[PDB]
C-alpha cells in the first residue's frame, strides 16, 4: 500500500472544516490537514499495535484502539 494519504480527499477535509465551523478554507489547508491526520494516526496505531503484540495476537481488536486512545487522554466512549 502506497500514497493512500490522498484518499483523504479535499471534499472530506472541507466537510470536516464545515462541521468545525469554518467558512472559507485556504488552498494549503488540505495538505496540512493530511499531515496532521497522518501524524495522529501513526501515534495512535503504534500504541494499538504494541497492545496487540503484547497479547501474542495477530488481530488489532477495537479494545486495543480504545486503550491506545485512553492512554493519550482521548478516552473514546462507545466501542467496548
Amino acid at each position: 500500500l502506497r500514497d493512500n494519504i490522498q484518499g483523504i480527499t479535499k471534499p472530506a477535509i472541507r466537510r470536516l472544516a464545515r462541521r468545525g465551523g469554518v467558512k472559507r478554507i485556504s488552498g494549503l489547508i488540505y495538505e496540512e490537514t493530511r499531515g496532521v491526520l497522518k501524524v495522529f494516526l501513526e501515534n495512535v496505531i503504534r500504541d494499538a499495535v504494541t497492545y496487540t503484540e503484547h497479547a501474542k495476537r495477530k488481530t488489532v481488536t477495537a479494545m486495543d484502539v480504545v486503550y491506545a486512545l485512553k492512554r493519550q487522554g482521548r478516552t473514546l466512549y462507545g466501542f467496548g
Binding site: 493512500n4 480527499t9 472530506a12 472544516a17 469554518v22 494549503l28 496532521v36 488481530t59 484502539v65
Partner: protein, 97 residues
Amino acid sequence: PHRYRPGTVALREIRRYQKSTELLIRKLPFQRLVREIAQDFKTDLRFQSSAVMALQEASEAYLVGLFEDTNLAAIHAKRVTIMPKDIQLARRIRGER
C-alpha cells in the same frame, strides 16, 4: 441563472454538517490508509472492523476539534479564511509541537 453569493452556501453546509452525526471521511480510503500506516510497525496484520471504525471516529473528532481551534485562531487575526499558520499556532498552543 440564479447564483448564490459566496457566504451563503458555506454557512448552509456548516449548519448541515453540524446538525448531523455521520462520518465525513470515506471508509475504504481511510481503512487503506490505516493499513498502510500499520504496515510499518508489523507486517501481516488483520484489522478488526470495529477497530477501524473506532480509529475513524477518534480521528474525525480530533480533526473537528483542531479545525474549531484553527477557526478561533483565524478570527483572532482579523481574518475569515483559515491558513496553515492558524493550524500551526493551534497545535503549538495545545502542546503538540
